[PDB]
Amino acid sequence: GLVYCAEANPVSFNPQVTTTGSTIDIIANQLYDRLISIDPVTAEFKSELATDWKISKDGKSVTFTLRKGVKFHTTAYFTPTREFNADDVIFTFSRLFDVYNPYHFVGDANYPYFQSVGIDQLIRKIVRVSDHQVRFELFNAESSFLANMATDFAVVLSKEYAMALKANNQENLFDQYPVGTGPYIYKEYRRDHLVRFYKNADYWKHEVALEQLVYDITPNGTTRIAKILTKECDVTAHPSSAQLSILAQRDDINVERETNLNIGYWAFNTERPPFDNLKVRQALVHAIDIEKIMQAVYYGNGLRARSILPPTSWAFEPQKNMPIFDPQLAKKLLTEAGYEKGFDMSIWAMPVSRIYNPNARKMAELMQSDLRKIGVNVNIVEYEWNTFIQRIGEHRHDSVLLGWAADTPDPDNFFSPLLSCTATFSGKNPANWCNPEFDLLLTKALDTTDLNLRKQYYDAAQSMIIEQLPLYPIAHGMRFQASSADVEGITLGPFGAISLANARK
């Protein structure tokens, strides 16, 4: 068996109803399968529960052919009567949007990943063409649809089980006591103590290597590392750069580190004087001591940015024109541009800690001190999250420390959601920046099927970011993982929830 040191109780056992990272880490890859996934090496789509997928020419129809012979879990509480088929995909996904689907309103009617990404408003209908073929009809063509179907959240559930529960008026057990097609089956959950899954002996994809997975709920990070040392835990739910050093001198413990697909940045409201002036953005960026901020904000858990894309993005290209830290340069430029001398501006600090920026307030303070030297007086603006995001959406700010954790490993996901003209009108562009040349590079890249030629466009898009500074790429949050050297099949990736599907001793 394996012992994984979890950082929190799962808030649910159905990925559909939560974006809480530490929950997803426990349930998604272990209990479930998706229709399709993304090949890590080649970045192409790979068959999972779907063996085939075809996009209509008009792009508003996507037809999945479905694996035969796939069984749902036999759990203590549920025994399937039929194998996985199209009805299951139809039930599973129409739950997100169909006010007539019997599970749409259990319990919160909230499906946060799909809402944040628009799938719930995109899918018009799902048609059963045959027992093992299903067609999604979309209100419009949408390049990101397949990528969304390949995320940790797009798991397939049991319609048979859902209906049996509904017959008992026991719908609230569905997301709490799971039935999946994945490599492990739910055994037991004890709040604040542990969760236990056992081997799925009928698993379609491979011969599951472990009889038992035990998740030891251990909120305290220090204790999680301590349990690594004692061989009490075999794997630890992330830790931080500091907690890891203490492991360096142990033979029998592996420490892993991978820059996660995300970016923390300083974005300029490019429509609000004087930040609408390229020369003003150039000047200010030179004033920022980013070394100081790696040390006093990220504390060794971040990787300094060389582009808006982390080196783990397959489209990454190092930007040669990244501004150097030079206050004298900054002051000389600022005066060359007017001001003449100085001005007051506010830096909006995101209210919550995240991988891509663990303390924006603190970052705002350091910036406030750098900028003060140059005649620029920062007022640090902080609102509670939801109001903060709306107002940034409404372009109320001068500038904002914020960031992005990619929803997909598709490089487009760093460009189109953040900096495109239509992200302007969707209140998702922190820089209020509509640049039709930039946007065209994105359309062209999405219009070509040979990833090699896409790079040429993304290179251009990265080069254009540094040149026009709608936002200043600061840093990439890293993910770490510690484990007993006895365990393999567990390699940490730059993207997605933890997976123990191939965990082996």
Residue set of the binding site: 19, 21, 354, 356, 428
Q: H-helix or E-strand containing 194?
A: strand 194-199
Which residue pairs from 103-106 have beta carbons closer than 8 angstroms and sit at least 24 positions apart in sequence? Answer: 103/162, 103/166, 103/171, 103/174, 106/171, 106/172, 106/174, 106/175
Structure tokens at 28: 């998604």
Structure tokens at 80: 């399937």
Residue indicated by tokens 């209990």: 31
Q: Any idea what DSSP says for residue 354?
A: B
Residue set of the binding site for L-glutamate: 19, 21, 354, 356, 428
- Close Cβ partners of 382 (under 8 Å, ≥ 6 residues apart): 348, 349, 351, 361, 388
SS3 101: coil
Q: Any idea what DSSP says for residue 288?
A: -
b/e for 377-399, b at 16 or more Cβ within 10 A?
Answer: ebebbebeeeebbebbeebbbbb
- Close Cβ partners of 249 (under 8 Å, ≥ 6 residues apart): none
Q: At residue 72, what are phi and psi to the nearest 5 degrees?
A: -75, 160
DSSP 60-75: SEEEEEE-SSPPPP--
Work out whether strand 184-190 and strand 194-199 pair parallel, antiparallel, or are unpaired.
Answer: antiparallel
Between CA 477 and CA 117 the distance in angstroms is 22
